[PDB]
Paper text:
Uropathogenic Escherichia coli strains use filamentous type 1 pili to adhere to and invade uroepithelial cells. The pilus rod is a helical assembly of up to 3000 copies of the main subunit FimA, terminated by a single copy of the subunit FimI that anchors the rod to the assembly platform FimD in the outer membrane. The assembly platform FimD in the outer membrane of uropathogenic E. coli is the catalyst of type 1 pilus assembly.
As a consequence of the fact that incorporation of the first FimA subunit is rate limiting for pilus rod assembly, we obtained a mixture of FimD-rod complexes and FimDHGFC complexes that had not yet incorporated a single FimA after completion of FimD-catalyzed tip assembly. In conformer 1, the structure closely resembles PDB-ID 6E1522, with the NTD remaining unoccupied. However, the resolution did not allow unambiguous assignment of the incorporated subunits.
Numbering used by the authors:
A (entry chain G): 1 to 144
B (entry chain H): 1 to 279
C (entry chain D): 113 to 187, 196 to 451, 474 to 562, 567 to 804, 808 to 833
D (entry chain F): 1 to 25, 39 to 154
E (entry chain C): 1 to 92, 100 to 205
Write the structure that this text describes.
């Protein structure tokens, strides 16, 4: 009343810390009789990316995926095995190909994010040739 | 008889009646606070001093107008203290010179509040005075009404204390952070002072002010005010001790605070009102 | 008898009958996840944080009850988060959830609530009945052969009886192109027709209906936002000629929204879905408004040039259109609602080893001239094994002034490139990030798996940041993660210019069942229990770090619901006296189910008797059973029978027709050391 | 960048899923031929050539005839002669040196069609039940 | 129909046992699997015991065979040894029935071998005579040469013994250069190579 104070400011989202930096998925030894028909795929393998120590002000985290994708759109195989591609999805049945982004909320009680994913190897053209499978997917996080 | 001022030089309309546009420098003083000092502005002279000598007086009924119309005080008429509003005719002042001598008239206001004030915008009337002028040449006596107008925006103090600024804006750093609020108060006499904040608080303790941001508010966070690391709840009096003519800093420091649950990025804005109370 | 297959009730490939789906076993479930850090600063001192997330659960037959809690300590009380009781309705192909949950943002916005929700499940459909794919209709003069070619490769080959035929088992592979269907008659006449197709996310296969019915109380997580009761129902129905008709409705005390729309698979022009939502909303200030929002989505598959328009979306909302969350505030930017949102997502293939990617979002509000902008363009190059990435990002928020830009260059080089050693499972990463405002950060890191089973994963990355704000510094992050048979653990150390912090954590899952308690890695939604008593450390192959307990039970954290999962034990890791009757089992679990994979591990000396009856070898196929133990076998050539888990000395019963023989043996006491032993016996 | 996912694995090669089909039923009398087939499907990509041979109990009259089982009611001098796709006698109990490599197309199912016919040599051949269990040997390259 | 998990089994010296897989994809068929390992001379000597030697498979089922050594280091330790692994599926009215035997190569590989397996196919040598081509292999590996081409005519496949030789019939209408391919330890085809005379 006698004197007025206008206090302005802003809350901005600061980066968290990444707990899983070099996650790996070992599909094991696959058999070519099960990956012969077109569209045949291996079994789903789960991979989880968790972040911790999210500062207050960061309520959502968006992970962007990137990798070498062949003409089929799935991540290319740098191993010897041919006619095979690496597929990555979330638990919501959404294909997170190269360039795809998924957004999750930050648990207020523990200040931690968690990306539930699942990876497999599938043949689209059919006839998966014998050989090694090796692929790398790089994920970058933007905090909002 | 010609009267003029350097800044406005208002044209008189309707005989001796005229307006004026003069700057205001209200300063808190012991007893009463001066509002307008017409001595530095109004300059009057006699066109023909050798033939006609004028006598100017202030008739009863002169008062304030608008928001000031409910306030009183005193008038320094040629160095004489006369109670205000004018309930009687003041002694006249002679004019028999061609020089633009200053008009010895000062206007005061009686303190009725603790430290509050009223804001007057430019171009708004403040006082309405009734003047009566006679002459030694003959019985030509004429009365007119002078209305005082403001050419600038200023807040005339109503209480016995003054503050550095009536409106203070402070920008906190990004969450989390703090900022000291620049605000000091002084008074004409050594007296105890107490101030309490105001506003729409959020928590049940009346200590966290709601984030009243217009565009993209940051939910779950509000603004607190502290002093010397002590939380100040709203509508709780804090005593400043003995405050004299020297300015005393309230020590207020704005800080962030958490109101609800998850904090979301965005803007934060809180408007707080501090009122001063005598002790 | 020749019948057209259009009404032959043909089954899709990968069709598992609903009677084979396993509800699981009754069990108790726990997931613990403890994390913490001990920060140290040059100015400020030491700080401690800890967070224990505890998720409890219980399966009783066909239900699944789950609960979440978190204990947080800072330098201090439990805090409930969620709880829900769920089951799946097989006859309706649906799933009902009671308690804390969320809706789906297919049509309206995502809404958290605490009520009931019955929604159709897409995981019950076979893998060839999920997504969008045209239903190929045709006619055949006689017994013909139908082959569908996509991108030059035969993806569907079948023999069709005379008469009209329909095919609906096509996999969702619209990104490959167009399906050229050719039907060859016995004489030789060929019928050719091409079906090109593209799908937006809201296109359903012909005859397929998706739905959700939710009734509850809007839970928001905000202390200034009310919790009003609401009912939301959404539906989508595929239709012939590549159509899809969908809609929905939200009803509440101060909100009524009705949405209706249609999508079409135009073919060579790509898929386009248009819908319109009319919302009448009563604002917190008791002011009624009405509005209409129109949303278009467009999707084009890969062309010959390689370009595919993954998404082009545009949503326009009038002045009076408000969301449900807007009217829930307790009696804000309600005068600055959104005018229009434009989304773009495009991908290009620039040769055999290069891929370009574009993404962008542009949100314009009512009243204000501020716009929310987001842009992200990437270029990926493969080379042989050196992966290069050049990314650019541009973000501008409406409530802040200035554009956050970034231009990053990443290089990934496996160490197998430099080598022909434990460094085969390792690689090097170099990042160079430019803020486009003066700042510049270099980063160099080495990461990979370490242990024999590749459980331990290390990652050490140093870096230097400088410029822009003058805060030049060197920062190092070292992370060590581990996945054991009793749970996961992780350590981390982040040394900045001033802040030095240490992160620690341990996570795991505990399963309580009729056979006791079993520890393992953090459980996912569906879990498989490997019951193999007598096998101490048998490696569950195709799983990382999973070993059986000292009793023989191991929990597999992950299993695919409503699909056949193969659970196998590695016989190279079994003890010298343990023989599995069958090392491989198959499980078909439902969502949330804990299914046992029971294995019969005979423990004892393995032996190979040569049985002789009447001075002649025992006949082929004769059954042999141990009396004291439970071992059994079938006589092979030369009268040799192999028995596992036999005692040191006992009796053998032989039966080959309408017992007939008794065999006694006495091995030396030092015969257990040998993996397999051979002996001879006799009969009556 | 911030995180990486390294997917490793191996795709192995396998044999051929072989499905066989049971066959229902003067000197040198030959009955009409009954056809049967051997279906190799699915066959791995690396499976290029295989060796196919037939094994069984040679007849007393001649070693090139598959003898019948020792049935209590079995015809005397009655054997089962196996003909290849080109209607030529398949050498019974042929060694690996005598056997030859037959090629298979990877991916597509492969079929090997043979015929079986009853051969009577001890005329007058008595009446008896006909039963035989032969062995189809498939050796991988 | 039964299917083995591999067309070759490499048995390193000193291992406790090796593992193979059998798969029956027929939902209605029923089989009796009998397995055994014979030496290079085709006589069952009991040097390797496949466990379980005889077991019944009902319908669609995937089972595991454990090949157990019995050599006790009585075999040569300087050259690879060859055995034949046989897996027979007895199926289970005037009906002729067929029992399918699947035959694969079991390569006993002694430990501490000098030449790496990858560089074994490059060390063969050839010599051409009147209607005969002799392949000599000085490596201590059993080398399976396939897709032999002496110019334009296609020659027969061969299995050249370690530190040994083999002979392939050569028609007169043959070219000067010879191109050959071998099959590595994983069952894959090695790249085409050019043979060298003498």
């Amino acid at each position: 009343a006698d004197v007025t104070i206008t206090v302005n400011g802003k809350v901005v989202a600061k980066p968290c810390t990444v707990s899983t930096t070099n996650a790996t998925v070992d599909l094991g030894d696959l058999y070519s009789f099960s990956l012969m028909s077109a569209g045949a795929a291996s079994a789903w393998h789960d991979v989880a990316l968790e972040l911790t120590n999210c500062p207050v002000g960061t309520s959502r985290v968006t992970a962007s995926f990137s990798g070498a994708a062949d003409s089929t759109g799935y991540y290319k195989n740098q191993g010897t095995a041919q006619n095979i591609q690496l597929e990555l999805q979330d638990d919501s049945g959404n294909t997170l190909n190269t360039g795809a982004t998924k957004t999750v909320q930050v648990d207020d009680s523990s200040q931690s994010a968690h990306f539930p994913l699942q990876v497999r190897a599938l043949t689209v053209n059919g006839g998966a040739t014998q050989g090694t499978i090796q692929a790398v997917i790089s994920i970058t996080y933007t905090y909002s | 008889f010609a009267c003029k001022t350097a800044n406005g030089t208002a044209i008189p309309i309707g005989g001796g009646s005229a307006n004026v546009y003069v700057n205001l420098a209200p300063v808190v003083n012991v007893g009463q606070n001066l509002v307008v000092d017409l001595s530095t502005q109004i300059f009057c002279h006699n066109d023909y001093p050798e033939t006609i000598t004028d006598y100017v007086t202030l008739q009863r009924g002169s008062a304030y107008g608008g928001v000031l119309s409910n306030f009183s005080g005193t008038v320094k008429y040629s160095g004489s203290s006369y109670p205000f509003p004018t309930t009687s005719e003041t002694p006249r002042v002679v004019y028999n010179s061609r020089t633009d001598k200053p008009w010895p008239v000062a206007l005061y206001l009686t303190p009725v509040s603790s430290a509050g004030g009223v804001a007057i915008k430019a171009g708004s009337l403040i006082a309405v005075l009734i003047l009566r002028q006679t002459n030694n040449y003959n019985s030509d006596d004429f009365q007119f009404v002078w209305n005082i107008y403001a050419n600038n925006d200023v807040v005339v103090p109503t209480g016995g204390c003054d503050v550095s600024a009536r409106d203070v804006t402070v920008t906190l750093p990004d969450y989390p952070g703090s900022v000291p609020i620049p605000l000091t108060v002084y008074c004409a006499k050594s007296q105890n002072l107490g101030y309490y904040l105001s506003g729409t608080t959020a928590d049940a303790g009346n200590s966290i002010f709601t984030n009243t941001a217009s565009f993209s508010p940051a939910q779950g966070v509000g603004v607190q005010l502290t002093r010397n690391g002590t939380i100040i709840p709203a509508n709780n009096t804090v005593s400043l001790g003995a405050v004299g003519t020297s300015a005393v800093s309230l020590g207020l420091t704005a800080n962030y605070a958490r109101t609800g649950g998850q904090v979301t990025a965005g803007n934060v804005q809180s408007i707080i009102g501090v009122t001063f109370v005598y002790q | 008898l020749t019948i057209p297959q259009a009404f032959m009730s043909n089954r899709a490939r990968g069709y598992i009958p609903p009677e084979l789906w396993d509800p699981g076993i009754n069990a108790g479930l726990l997931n613990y996840n403890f994390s913490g850090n001990s920060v140290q600063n040059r100015i400020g001192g030491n700080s401690h944080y800890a967070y224990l997330n505890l998720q409890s659960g219980l399966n009783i037959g066909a239900w699944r009850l789950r609960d979440n809690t978190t204990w947080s300590y800072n330098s201090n009380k439990w805090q409930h988060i969620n709880t829900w009781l769920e089951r799946d309705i097989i006859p309706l192909r649906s799933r009902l959830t009671l308690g804390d949950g969320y809706t789906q943002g297919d049509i309206f916005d995502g809404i958290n609530f605490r009520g009931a929700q019955l929604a159709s499940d897409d995981n019950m459909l076979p893998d060839s009945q999920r997504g969008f794919a045209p239903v190929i209709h045709g006619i055949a003069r006689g017994t013909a052969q139908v082959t569908i070619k996509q991108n030059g490769y035969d993806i569907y080959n079948s023999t069709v009886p005379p008469g009209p035929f329909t095919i609906n088992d096509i996999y969702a592979a619209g990104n490959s192109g167009d399906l050229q269907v050719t039907i060859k008659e016995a004489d030789g006449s060929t019928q050719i027709f091409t079906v090109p197709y593209s799908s937006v996310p809201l296109l359903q296969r012909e005859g397929h209906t998706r739905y959700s019915i939710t009734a509850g109380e809007y839970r928001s997580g905000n202390a200034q936002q009310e919790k009003p009761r609401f009912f939301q129902s959404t539906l989508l129905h595929g239709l012939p000629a590549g159509w899809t008709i969908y809609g929905g409705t939200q009803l509440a005390d101060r909100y009524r929204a009705f949405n209706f729309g249609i999508g079409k698979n135009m073919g060579a022009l790509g898929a386009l879905s248009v819908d319109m939502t009319q919302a009448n909303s009563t604002l917190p200030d008791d002011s009624q408004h009405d509005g209409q929002s129109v949303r278009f989505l467009y999707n084009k598959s890969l062309n010959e040039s390689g370009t595919n328009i993954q998404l082009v979306g545009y949503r326009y909302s009038t002045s009076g259109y408000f969301n449900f969350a807007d009217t829930t505030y307790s009696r804000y930017n309600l005068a600055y609602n959104k005018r229009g949102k434009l989304q773009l997502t495009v991908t290009q293939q620039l040769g055999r080893t290069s891929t370009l990617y574009l993404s962008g979002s542009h949100q314009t509000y009512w009243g204000t001239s501020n716009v929310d902008e987001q842009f992200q363009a990437g270029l990926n190059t493969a080379f042989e094994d050196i992966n290069w990435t050049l990314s650019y990002s541009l973000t501008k928020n409406a409530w802040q002034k200035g554009r956050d830009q970034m231009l990053a260059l990443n290089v990934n080089i496996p160490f197998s490139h430099w080598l022909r050693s434990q460094w085969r499972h390792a690689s090097a990463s170099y990042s160079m990030s430019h803020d486009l405002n003066g700042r510049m950060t270099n980063l160099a890191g080495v990461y990979g798996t370490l242990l024999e089973d590749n459980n331990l994963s290390y990652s050490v990355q140093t870096g230097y940041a400088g410029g822009g704000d003058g805060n030049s510094g060197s920062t190092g992050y070292a992370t060590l993660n581990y996945r054991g048979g009793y749970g996961n653990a992780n350590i981390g150390y982040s040394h900045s210019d001033d802040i030095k912090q240490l992160y620690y954590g341990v996570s795991g899952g505990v399963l309580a069942h009729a056979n006791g308690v079993t520890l393992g890695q953090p459980l996912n939604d569906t879990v498989v229990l490997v019951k193999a008593p007598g096998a101490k450390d048998a490696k569950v192959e195709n799983q990382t770090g999973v070993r059986t307990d000292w009793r023989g039970y191991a929990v597999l954290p992950y299993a695919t619901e409503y699909r056949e999962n193969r659970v196998a034990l590695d016989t190279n890791t079994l003890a010298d006296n343990v023989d599995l009757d069958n090392a491989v089992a198959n499980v078909v679990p439902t969502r949330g189910a804990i299914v046992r994979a029971e294995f019969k591990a005979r423990v004892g000396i393995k032996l190979l008797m040569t049985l002789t009856h009447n001075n002649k070898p025992l006949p082929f196929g004769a059954m042999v059973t141990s009396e004291s133990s439970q071992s059994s076998g079938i006589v092979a050539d030369n009268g040799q029978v192999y028995l596992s888990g036999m005692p040191l000395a006992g009796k053998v019963q032989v039966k080959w027709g309408e017992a007939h023989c008794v065999a006694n043996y006495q091995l030396p006491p030092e015969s257990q050391q040998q993996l397999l032993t051979q002996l001879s016996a006799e009969c009556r | 960048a911030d995180s990486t996912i390294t997917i490793r694995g191996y795709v192995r090669d396998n044999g051929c899923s072989v499905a066989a089909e049971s066959t229902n039923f003067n000197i040198g009398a030959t009955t009409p031929v009954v056809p049967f087939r051997i279906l190799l499907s699915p066959c791995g990509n690396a499976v290029s050539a295989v060796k196919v041979g037939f094994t069984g109990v040679a007849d007393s009259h001649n070693a090139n005839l598959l003898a019948l089982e020792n049935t209590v009611s079995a015809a005397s001098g009655l054997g089962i002669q196996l003909l290849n796709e080109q209607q030529n006698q398949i050498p019974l109990n042929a060694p690996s040196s005598a056997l030859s490599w037959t090629t298979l197309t990877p991916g597509k199912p492969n079929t090997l069609n043979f015929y079986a016919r009853l051969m009577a040599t001890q005329v007058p051949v008595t009446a008896g039940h006909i039963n035989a269990t032969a062995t189809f040997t498939l050796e991988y390259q | 129909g039964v299917a083995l998990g591999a067309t070759r089994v490499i048995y390193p010296a000193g291992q406790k046992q090796e593992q193979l897989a059998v798969t029956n994809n027929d939902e209605n068929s029923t089989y009796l699997i009998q397995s055994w390992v014979e030496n290079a001379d085709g006589v069952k000597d009991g040097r390797f015991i496949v466990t379980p030697p005889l077991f019944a498979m009902k319908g669609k089922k995937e089972n595991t065979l454990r090949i157990l050594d019995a050599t006790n280091n009585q075999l040569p330790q300087d050259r690879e040894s060859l055995f034949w692994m046989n897996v027979k599926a007895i199926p289970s009215e005037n009906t002729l029935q067929l029992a399918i035997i699947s035959r694969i190569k079991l390569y006993y590989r002694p430990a501490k071998l000098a030449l790496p397996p990858d560089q074994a196919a490059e060390k063969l040598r050839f010599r051409r005579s009147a209607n005969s081509l002799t392949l000599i292999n000085p490596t201590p590996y059993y080398l399976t040469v396939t897709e032999l081409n002496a110019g334009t005519r296609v020659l027969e496949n061969a299995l050249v013994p370690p530190m040994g030789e083999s002979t392939v019939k050569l028609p007169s209408d043959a070219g000067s250069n010879i191109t050959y391919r071998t099959i590595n330890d994983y069952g894959a085809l090695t790249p085409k190579m050019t043979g060298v005379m003498e």
